[PDB]
Each structure stands twice: as C-alpha cells, then as structure tokens.
Enzyme design. Structure first.
Site, mmCIF file in Angstrom:
data_model
loop_
_atom_site.group_PDB
_atom_site.id
_atom_site.type_symbol
_atom_site.label_atom_id
_atom_site.label_comp_id
_atom_site.label_asym_id
_atom_site.label_seq_id
_atom_site.Cartn_x
_atom_site.Cartn_y
_atom_site.Cartn_z
ATOM 1 C CG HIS A 95 -1.966 1.065 1.212
ATOM 2 N ND1 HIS A 95 -3.040 1.093 0.349
ATOM 3 C CD2 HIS A 95 -2.083 2.165 1.995
ATOM 4 C CE1 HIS A 95 -3.769 2.168 0.594
ATOM 5 N NE2 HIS A 95 -3.211 2.834 1.589
HETATM 6 C C1 FAD Z 1 5.053 9.478 6.647
HETATM 7 C C2 FAD Z 1 4.490 8.086 6.701
HETATM 8 C C3 FAD Z 1 4.411 7.327 5.533
HETATM 9 C C4 FAD Z 1 3.895 6.030 5.564
HETATM 10 N N1 FAD Z 1 3.822 5.292 4.400
HETATM 11 C C5 FAD Z 1 3.315 4.005 4.408
HETATM 12 C C6 FAD Z 1 3.242 3.267 3.226
HETATM 13 O O1 FAD Z 1 3.629 3.748 2.166
HETATM 14 N N2 FAD Z 1 2.731 1.987 3.231
HETATM 15 C C7 FAD Z 1 2.289 1.423 4.409
HETATM 16 O O2 FAD Z 1 1.835 0.278 4.397
HETATM 17 N N3 FAD Z 1 2.358 2.149 5.588
HETATM 18 C C8 FAD Z 1 2.870 3.441 5.601
HETATM 19 N N4 FAD Z 1 2.941 4.180 6.779
HETATM 20 C C9 FAD Z 1 2.687 3.500 8.095
HETATM 21 C C10 FAD Z 1 1.188 3.451 8.369
HETATM 22 O O3 FAD Z 1 0.660 4.756 8.300
HETATM 23 C C11 FAD Z 1 0.898 2.867 9.742
HETATM 24 O O4 FAD Z 1 1.658 1.690 9.893
HETATM 25 C C12 FAD Z 1 -0.581 2.536 9.925
HETATM 26 O O5 FAD Z 1 -1.370 3.700 9.805
HETATM 27 C C13 FAD Z 1 -0.818 1.909 11.291
HETATM 28 O O6 FAD Z 1 -2.183 1.623 11.470
HETATM 29 P P1 FAD Z 1 -2.814 1.680 12.947
HETATM 30 O O7 FAD Z 1 -4.303 1.403 12.880
HETATM 31 O O8 FAD Z 1 -2.088 0.731 13.870
HETATM 32 O O9 FAD Z 1 -2.557 3.189 13.454
HETATM 33 P P2 FAD Z 1 -3.161 4.473 12.695
HETATM 34 O O10 FAD Z 1 -3.659 4.140 11.304
HETATM 35 O O11 FAD Z 1 -2.103 5.546 12.693
HETATM 36 O O12 FAD Z 1 -4.377 4.924 13.636
HETATM 37 C C14 FAD Z 1 -4.123 5.492 14.893
HETATM 38 C C15 FAD Z 1 -5.261 6.437 15.222
HETATM 39 O O13 FAD Z 1 -5.489 6.429 16.616
HETATM 40 C C16 FAD Z 1 -5.744 7.751 17.047
HETATM 41 N N5 FAD Z 1 -5.367 7.924 18.462
HETATM 42 C C17 FAD Z 1 -4.113 8.089 18.987
HETATM 43 N N6 FAD Z 1 -4.227 8.203 20.329
HETATM 44 C C18 FAD Z 1 -5.533 8.113 20.668
HETATM 45 C C19 FAD Z 1 -6.200 8.162 21.890
HETATM 46 N N7 FAD Z 1 -5.518 8.121 23.028
HETATM 47 N N8 FAD Z 1 -7.572 8.031 21.917
HETATM 48 C C20 FAD Z 1 -8.284 7.856 20.743
HETATM 49 N N9 FAD Z 1 -7.616 7.808 19.534
HETATM 50 C C21 FAD Z 1 -6.263 7.935 19.499
HETATM 51 C C22 FAD Z 1 -4.984 8.669 16.105
HETATM 52 O O14 FAD Z 1 -5.683 9.881 15.932
HETATM 53 C C23 FAD Z 1 -4.920 7.864 14.819
HETATM 54 O O15 FAD Z 1 -5.872 8.328 13.889
HETATM 55 C C24 FAD Z 1 3.451 5.475 6.764
HETATM 56 C C25 FAD Z 1 3.532 6.241 7.932
HETATM 57 C C26 FAD Z 1 4.047 7.538 7.908
HETATM 58 C C27 FAD Z 1 4.121 8.326 9.184
#
Ligand code: FAD
Ligand code: FAD
EC number: 1.8.1.12
Lengths: 489, 489
Positions: free
Chosen positions: A461
């Site tokens: 992705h």
């Molecule tokens: C610059 C950048 C580029 C990236 N590029 C890629 C890529 O090309 N391909 C890929 O596969 N991955 C990529 N990633 C990594 C990817 O974004 C993450 O691995 C992914 O979003 C993780 O999913 P998650 O559900 O665990 O966390 P997230 O999708 O980040 O969701 C976390 C959410 O929880 C919320 N939150 C935080 N604290 C609290 C709280 N205490 N109470 C309620 N809500 C809260 C936040 O607002 C956030 O929206 C990239 C990341 C970055 C920073």
C-alpha cells in the site's frame, strides 16, 4: 563430422538468434545464421535481431514511451508544474533519430557477438531450401538471383517470422504498414489507422501523442468492438479511454478505395459511403507467416493455413531434420514465445533432453495508453470449457487522478476462476503498470494459483496491484455456459 | 445484552476502522470507535482514517507522484518534447491544496459511512482505560480533562498506532517531523532530512522535487548506509541514484544542537564539527507506539519495549478481553498488516473462527525515486538461518534511458534462495514499477515459490519485470554463513 554445418537458421530473429547462440556456445556446434540485412531500415525493414528489435516491440515501445509524455505533461499541472501548454507539440524527427540510434546500437552489438562467438557465423541474403540438407543464400528474394553461398547442413531451422497483410483494395499501395510507420519523415496531421489488433491500437496511441496542432487520429475497424480475443469489459473501457484521450474510434467501417490527392494527401472512400482526407493511412489488419518465398515445396515441408509451417509440440516439420519456430508456425506470435520455442528446440535436439513449449497461461501486454496486462482465459472461453465459472471484477480510479485531472483513467481488474476448485483461469487488467504487474501474475498462474492464494496475500500500500488481493465476492457466475447472477442447482 | 457496546476501538486507524466496520456489518455488533478528530490537520494531525489516510501513505504518495514529474519533464526532452526548462520550479502551494482536498474528501466519506452503518458510532476525543470494560473519552490528552463520555463495553481494541520520536538535543523543538512537513506553507530552499528510514528517504525525494531555484536537500544519517534491513546492494545503488538526482547523502553524521537565526532559518551544528544553515530541518529517526497516554497501568496491560502492547499471535493482551493491533504492538508497522491483524481479530472473537496474522513473507515498498519493491529475507539474514543459500543478481538499464538521458536509472533485481530445494526466500528490486511488481511476487512467495517457478514462466516483452524469469545462474553462494564463489562438497 561429414557436413559443413550442424545447424542452418533461416532468420536471425527473436527465436532464430536464441537457438543459434545456444547451439554454438552451450553445445559447441557449427551454426550458420541467415538474415536479409545487418542493420534496420527500408526497403527490407527487418534485419539481424528480427522484427522485435528492428521494427517491433523494441522501437514501438520507445515511441509509446514518447507519446505517453503528452498525458504526463498535462497531468503535472495539477501538482503545481506550470508551463506553456497551449500549442505544445513534440518533435517527431528527434524521436525517430533517438529510436534509430538505439536500434542501430543493438544491431552493432550483434556484429561483435558473431565476431566473438566461435562456431557461429552470419550469412547475409535471402535463404531458400534445396533439400533436407541444403540451404541456398540468394542475392535477392527473386528465385533467379545470384546464389551467394550454398550451406551444407545437418539441421535446418525456419525462423523467418511474419509479414503484414494488405487490404487488397483499389489504391491499397498508397497505404503504409507498421514497417513504414517507423520511418515516416514527419508526424502526420490527419492520420487513419485501419484495424483492431494490438498493433493498430498501440500506433493510434503513438500518432495521437506526436500529432501536430489541429492534428487528429481516427481508428477504423470493421467489427463491433476492437481487440477481439480480449476481455470484453477491458475492450469497452479502453475504447472509452481512447476516446477521452482524443482518438476517434470508428466501428463497422472499412476503406473501399484510396485515391492520391495531387497535394500529397490521401482521399479515402468508406464502407458507409463517407469520404475523408488523411495525410497518412496505416494498415494493421493481419500478419501472415513469411514462408511463400522459401521454396518449401522443393524440400517438401507442409504449409497449412496462410503458409504456416505445420509442426508438432517439439517444432518438428513434415521433414524429420527440418524445424520451425515463432511467427512462421502461426501459433502465439510473441517474442518470448519464439525465444522459448527456440530454447526448447536446442535442448531437445542438441541437449538430448526433449522439451515442449507451454503455450497456455502465457502472459502478454498491449502497450496502448492506458496499457493492457492479460494472462489466461476470457470469461466467454472459460464458460465454454468449464462446469462452473466465477467472474470477479473491480474498477477503481487511483487517487492521484483527482489531482492530475485524468478522471477517465480507471484501473480495471477482472479475475476469471473455475468455481469448482478456485483455480484462477484468467487475469485481465487495464491501466498503468498493467504490463509490469501481469508478469508476476503469470508466474502464479503457472504454479496453478487459486483465488484463495490472492486474497490471503497481504497487500502493498498504496499500489494499483494491491487490488488483486481484495477481491473475495464474485461479481457473477457462469453455470455450464450461461450467465447467472446467483449460484444454485 | 448487559452492556452498552460489544466493542470499543481506541483509534479509528487502518486497523481500527477495519475491525470496527467488520464487527458492525458482518456480525451486527454494537461498535464504538474513538479518535481524536474528524478531519486531518494540526495540531493533532492524525484523524478519522488514521495516520495512513491523514499523515501517511496516502498524502505521502501524492507528493511523491508530484515530485516524480521533475524527472519526467526533464526526460521528455530526449523524445522531442521542447519547453522552457531553465529556472522551472513547481508550485508547492497548489500541491498542498490538491492534497488537502483529497485527504479531507476521504475524511468526509467516513462521516457518511458512520451515518449509514447501524451499530457503528464515532466518539470524538482522547480515549483512556478505567478497567477491562470501561473506556473514558476525555476532552484532551491531559488526564484531568473533562470526561466527554464513559463507554461500557464487552471488548476493548487498542489501535492508537505510533508517533515520531524526537532528537533530544539542544534546539530539538526547532525541528519538524513528517506531521508538520505535510502542512508547510512554502517549499524550503535549504532542506535537511535527518534519518535513514524509508520516511527520511521518501521525503528527501519530495523536497528534492519541490525545492525552488538554487534549492538543495541534504540527507543526514548517523550510520554507514541508509535503509538498514534492506538488501545491501539495493541500498548502495539507491544512495548512488539519490546523489545523481541531486540529493546530497551524508553518512556517520548527527546534529549536535540547533539555534534559530533571527531571519527565520536554522543554524545546525554537526557531529564532525561543521555548521550549516537550513530553512527547515526534518527528523525521521523513529516511530514509537502511542500508548503512554492510555492509562494502561489502570487496566493492567503489559507494555514492553518503548510502550509496545504485548500480544500473542491472536493480538490478545495481558487482559483476556482487551486486544491490540497495528503500530501500537510494534511488529511490522504497515497499513495492510494492521488491516489484516484487525480482520483476523474480528474473525477470531466475533466470527468464532480463530486466525493468526502471517507476518513472514510480507511484501512492502519504499516510494523513493527510484522506488524499492521488497519481499522476504536479505542475504545476510538468510545466510544465518539456512544451510546453503544461493544469491541471484541482475542489473540492467532500460533502453528508454538512452533517449531520456537518465543513464543512472539502473533497474536491479536480487533473488535470495535456499539452495537445498530452490525455494525463494527473498526478492529485492530497485527501479520504476518496483512497488507494483513486488505485489504479485508476494503472492508467489506466499505459495512457497521456487527459483524454477520463475525461469520456467514465459516473459512479457518488453517490461522490467520480465527479468525475474531470466535469472538461472546464481551470482554467488552462502555455505553455512560464509560467502563462497562456487559450491564445494
Ligand atoms: C510518513 C508516513 C508514511 C507512511 N507510508 C506508508 C506506506 O507507504 N505503506 C504502508 O503500508 N504504511 C505506511 N505508513 C505506516 C502506516 O501509516 C501505519 O503503519 C498505519 O497507519 C498503522 O495503522 P494503525 O491502525 O495501527 O494506526 P493508525 O492508522 O495511525 O491509527 C491510529 C489512530 O489512533 C488515534 N489515536 C491516537 N491516540 C488516541 C487516543 N488516546 N484516543 C483515541 N484515539 C487515538 C490517532 O488519531 C490515529 O488516527 C506510513 C507512515 C508515515 C508516518
Ligand atoms: C509493430 C509490432 C509490434 C510488436 N510488439 C510486440 C510486443 O510488444 N511484444 C511481443 O512479445 N511481440 C511483439 N511483436 C511480435 C514480434 O515482433 C514477433 O512475434 C517476433 O519477432 C517473432 O520472432 P521470430 O524469430 O519468429 O521472427 P522475427 O523476430 O521477425 O525474425 C524474422 C527474421 O527473419 C528474416 N527473414 C525473413 N525471410 C528471410 C529469408 N528468406 N532468408 C533469411 N532471413 C529471412 C527477417 O529479416 C527477420 O529479421 C510485435 C510485432 C510488430 C510488427
């Protein structure tokens, strides 16, 4: 040895050279390779390296790449790239120059290949047969030309490939084919492409990119839908996308006669009675095997449909020591297929380890704009040969095209499976990177991949290819030959 | 029921929303989803949709696509595309505008998703735990904020993801991270990227594309070679190619302190004693799980290294009814991984059909210029875990770059196999279309593909991907941990 050569190869093409090189280096055989000329160009066009190198895949793709910049330059605007776009046209002459430089460069790397390889020699001229062991190289195609040399050989391999068919119509000789298109002095202002094959479509895309101001290109096909043998939804979506990109697609239409206007252009009379002027008219209506001038009768090699040399699964002809590969056999007319057939031939005869070329589940591409990537069966065919067929379909527009402006550029994936066991029978893709993606798809299908293998794989992705892994629910079905919305018996 | 909700999801991220949606639609459960805000932007950055949608994969790729046009515009010249190139710079402001439009468009499609989905509700604010069954949504991150609501739930899923680490250095607060970079008013003239991760590399490439005249970007890394954990030959070849594209890569270097010049810019003191001025300084040096502000102690959830929530193969925490997925668990920090983990969680707990997420042979990409496509083991790792390892390598320059001028743009493929049975353990690619190709490679490797599966597949010509099928002879070997040229037994 009792003979001058182990192998005489008729045609230094994709398949010809591959075979010739293998026998020479890996099996230290005396190989003679016959082709018409040493470098690309008219009036012979094809040369050392074959159609693909000289007037095929290689030069065609460089030109597609060139024409692709039209869209790319337009699309950069949305991302902040400001520049004078109104009345911007590319230089056709610098493209052809660039292309010639490259093709000729490949031609020259072949000369020093022959010079360095022992047992491998190149023999320039037109080849023809005398008997099962004798190949005569003549000065011209004319059977009464000077004999340049007589090659006494053990084996003969025919790899002379194919040649464009003509329209057989009053004023037909006023038209060009793919051959002449590669050497046009100027990019035509009012261009007509006749045909509905991949060649017709790819070239329409090239001229559409390199047309001058007020220029336009019409694609004229005698059938209902372009690209017969392809996924119907893909064909329709490409027709729609060619339209959006400026190519006027015309259907159930056929030139009746062509007369040359005294200013240079061509007056074309059509099937429906209409008349129009075109600066250039290209025929891409079929490619027949090039075997008519080989004196195959003399050696007694059987030629079936359109001169195609009849061969078994090991490329053996009606004569036991004569073989034929590639476009001349009229199977799947692709470069890596001919290369594979040639590789198998050497492994069989000189390696002592027989092998047949696998013609099923071969992946191919159409370098239209946008490109097609395809491997396997169309639903229409799969439905005729299988009890239960599931059709998966997914269309989507990459997010970048909100910004780019090219909102017409839908990526399309269609997976065709045997519902019984989940085996993937066909994969059909439309959109950018499709030729690149389909290659690794073809590896999967070779391994007999199932639809469960796709959606169990974690995606990459963000990509277009990741949508292969996100297709679980079938769109509809085929129950023993007929389209059903739901499945039950 | 005895409880207000079946599931409370902490974080509406890639994994969060996936889980929440599944439980709600496919299993008709009462799901509550908690995230900090509704649309992207400072000072909170992440929002409904998670990092990927708001400040990650999605916006980052649109900007890479934008910066990619720099090379594409330069490259068109060789094909005949004439235009005023000298002193040509893109509009950073129209890019950010275009990006914001798209991201917030996705934010809005989520609002109406919640509105239409029954049993699924969004609860805006900062979440924290009270006990195994109670999630409190506070007004701010400060644990003494107003309690907005108290959610009485059966299950708790932690999917709060990760957050950028800082340098911990005099003047650290004068620096930006990936978060702030997405909202810069102007494209910096003198840019410094600290780090050697994919984020550091991808952004260096973005600023390199959007720099104004006389602008430049330095990439500063404290180790020997950028992109630890990647194929060594790939890392070196990319370093070389970033250089050729104008990015000055600096190695074994580290900011010591930063002081703000009174004109706005930043004075940076380095590890080696050098001093330089940069308009902006970005830190991409690590992302730690966001769990410090969750009151995990209260509920008694064990947090190991850097606050990572400890979980078994089914994402179960130290508390039986609490779960955690994605970046907060500190495994493989990728969007489709988190999505998969979330999907597995629902199937296990609410579907009654347990499943563990497969973390091995996961394909990923680096959207540098040129991009990386990788899946599997590096030779260094494979050599430590396997008896006999064969390394295949092939570099080539696509023919189009003779014309384009970008002769530095080598495509590289490196296949790592277990020599014993031929099984493909790693595939590493550098060059255009690499992210797209690797996806269908990942399907193969999932099916346990062997090197014989690759070179038995007939190629698609002409493509870059076709070179996967033309690698038969290994370049060298690893015999129980050590590099050998040929193999002795
Ligand atoms: C610059 C950048 C580029 C990236 N590029 C890629 C890529 O090309 N391909 C890929 O596969 N991955 C990529 N990633 C990594 C990817 O974004 C993450 O691995 C992914 O979003 C993780 O999913 P998650 O559900 O665990 O966390 P997230 O999708 O980040 O969701 C976390 C959410 O929880 C919320 N939150 C935080 N604290 C609290 C709280 N205490 N109470 C309620 N809500 C809260 C936040 O607002 C956030 O929206 C990239 C990341 C970055 C920073
Ligand atoms: C416009 C165009 C685009 C194409 N694009 C693609 C593509 O994208 N991908 C793909 O896979 N395929 C493509 N092809 C098809 C591909 O070029 C052929 O299928 C392939 O070259 C067949 O290999 P071959 O060895 O059988 O014949 P060729 O490679 O054509 O070799 C035949 C050679 O034999 C020589 N010859 C002919 N008669 C004699 C004689 N009597 N004596 C001595 N030599 C003789 C000719 O000079 C010629 O060089 C394209 C073809 C065309 C026309």
């Amino acid at each position: 040895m009792s003979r001058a050569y182990d192998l005489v190869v008729l045609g230094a093409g994709s398949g010809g050279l591959e075979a010739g090189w293998n026998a020479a280096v890996t099996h230290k055989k005396k190989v003679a390779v016959v082709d018409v000329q040493a470098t690309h160009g008219p009036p012979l066009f094809a040369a050392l390296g074959g159609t693909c190198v000289n007037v095929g895949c290689v030069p065609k793709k460089l030109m597609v790449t060139g024409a692709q910049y039209m869209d790319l330059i337009r699309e950069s605007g949305g991302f902040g790239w400001e520049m004078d776009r109104e009345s911007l046209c590319p230089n056709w002459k610098t493209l052809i120059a660039a292309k010639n430089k490259v093709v000729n460069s490949i031609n020259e790397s072949y000369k020093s290949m022959f010079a360095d390889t022992e047992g491998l020699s190149f023999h320039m001229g037109f080849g023809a047969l005398q008997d099962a062991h004798t190949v005569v190289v003549r000065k011209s195609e004319d059977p009464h030309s000077d004999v340049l040399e007589t090659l006494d050989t053990e084996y003969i391999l025919i790899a002379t490939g194919s040649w464009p068919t003509r329209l057989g119509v009053p004023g037909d000789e006023f038209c060009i084919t793919s051959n002449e298109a590669f050497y046009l002095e100027d990019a035509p202002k009012r261009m007509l492409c006749v045909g509905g094959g991949y060649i017709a479509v790819e070239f329409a895309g090239i001229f559409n990119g390199y047309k001058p101001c007020g220029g336009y290109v019409d694609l004229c096909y005698r059938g209902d839908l372009i690209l017969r043998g392809f996924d119907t939804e893909v064909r329709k979506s490409l027709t729609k996308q060619l339209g959006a990109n400026g190519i006027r697609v015309r259907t159930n239409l056929n030139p009746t006669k062509i007369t040359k206007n005294e200013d240079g252009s061509n007056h074309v009379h059509f099937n429906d009675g209409t008349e129009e002027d075109y600066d250039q008219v290209m025929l891409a209506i079929g490619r027949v095997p090039r075997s008519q001038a080989l004196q195959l009768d003399k050696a007694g090699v059987r030629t079936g449909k359109n001169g195609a040399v009849q061969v078994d699964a090991y490329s053996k002809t009606s004569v036991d020591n004569i073989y034929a590969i590639g476009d001349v056999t009229n199977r799947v007319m692709l470069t890596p297929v001919a290369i594979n057939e040639g590789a198998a031939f050497v492994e069989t005869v000189f390696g002592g380890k027989p092998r047949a070329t696998d013609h099923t589940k071969v992946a191919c591409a159409v370098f239209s704009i946008p490109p097609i990537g395809t491997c396997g069966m169309t639903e229409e065919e799969a439905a005729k040969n299988y009890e239960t067929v599931a059709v998966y379909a997914s269309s989507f527009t990459p997010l970048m095209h909100n910004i780019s402006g090219s909102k017409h550029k839908e990526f399309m994936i269609r997976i065709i499976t045997n519902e019984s066991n989940g085996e993937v029978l066909g994969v059909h893709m439309l959109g950018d990177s499709a030729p690149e993606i389909i290659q690794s798809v073809g590896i999967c299908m070779k391994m007999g991949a199932k639809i469960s293998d796709f959606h169990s794989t974690i995606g990459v992705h963000p990509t277009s290819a990741e949508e292969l892994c996100s297709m679980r629910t079938p769109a509809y079905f085929y129950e023993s030959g007929k389209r059903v919305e739901k499945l039950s018996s």
